[PDB]
Amino acid sequence: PDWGYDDKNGPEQWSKLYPIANGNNQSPVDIKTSETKHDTSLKPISVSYNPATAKEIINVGHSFHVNFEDNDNRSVLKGGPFSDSYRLFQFHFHWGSTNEHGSEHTVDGVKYSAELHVAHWNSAKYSSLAEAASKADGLAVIGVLMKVGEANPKLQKVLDALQAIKTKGKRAPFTNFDPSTLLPSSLDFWTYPGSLTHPPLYESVTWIICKESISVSSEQLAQFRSLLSNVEGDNAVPMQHNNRPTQPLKGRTVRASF
Ligand SMILES: NS(=O)(=O)c1c(F)c(F)c(N2CCCCC2)c(F)c1F
Ligand SMILES: [Zn+2]
């Protein structure tokens, strides 16, 4: 692929093939809490996911994804800034090379060790993910900052699955899993209009960033980093990091629900 996270093909370089990299609505961002606007029009976030929609886990080379069946509204996000319900299609993580960075969003400059993204597409307005992905109101992503500390037992099925998808392109069934079990117990959030955080970088995402972090151990983060970006048979190339730097707000307002 034309892009990665390496020195040559990584975030610093994306704008060459994806000029939107320098756009006005790029993600992730640093959330400065003294510049947020508390907003009473927001509703609470409501997730209702059906574990029967979990489908597959797959190694996509720069990361791994857990995908869900998205042919109907069995698993949905509602509330917050939204009037439409958004259909779950995937979750995945971002991490860094050491515990000291790795999240995509930061809060008052503080970097967390990893970030969970639970991604959804607007099935009220669009008929598929590929249609929704380029639309300003097409995607809703919950970002959960992950703070290195106590092992998180809720990650267990995900981590136990990685041994079946060690190298790029490997897929496996991943069933009977409700990813709302990964969310923090408080769903207070910030929201802002932004983008996908890697190519094609479309400015189609309403971000929902949880105020409360969830934990992850140093050894759990190691399991992410020991996934391999090469295909089976080649020299092992671990996936050490896949977070993008924070981008300029360019005048957007981050709103707080709390
Ligand atoms: N890290 S993220 O949550 O911002 C994110 C995402 F959720 C996506 F679905 C995609 N897409 C989905 C639409 C087409 C393929 C890639 C993407 F690029 C991406 F960066
Ligand atoms: Zn992501």
Domain boundary assignment for the chain: 1-258
Tell me, in angstroms, the distance from the centre of ligand 1 to residue 13's CA: 18
Q: What letters, b where the CB count within 10 A reaches 16 and e where it falls short, cover 97-129?
A: eebebbbbbbbeeebbbbbbbbbbbbbeebeeb
Ligand 1 pocket mutation, candidates 26, 198, 209, 247, criterion most atoms within 8 A of CB: 198
Beta strand 114-122 pairing with 139-148: antiparallel
Tell me, in angstroms, the distance from the centre of ligand 2 to residue 183's CA: 15
Determine the CATH number of domain 1-258. 3.10.200.10
Contacts of 243 (CB under 8 A, 6+ apart): 5, 28, 94, 95, 96, 101, 102, 103, 104, 115, 197
**55-to-28, 86, 90 alpha-carbon distances in Å:** 27, 18, 9
- Amino acid (1-letter code) at residue 205: V
C-alpha span between 159 and 54 (Å, rounded): 15
C-alpha span between 2 and 41 (Å, rounded): 41
Resolution at which this structure was determined, Å: 1.8
The technique by which this structure was obtained is X-ray
| Ligand 1: residue whose CA is nearest its atom 9 | 119
Query: Is 94 annotated among the ligand-binding residues?
Result: yes
* C-beta separation of 29 from 105 below 8 A: yes
Give the position, in ligand 1's atom list, of the atom nearest the Cα of 199. 18
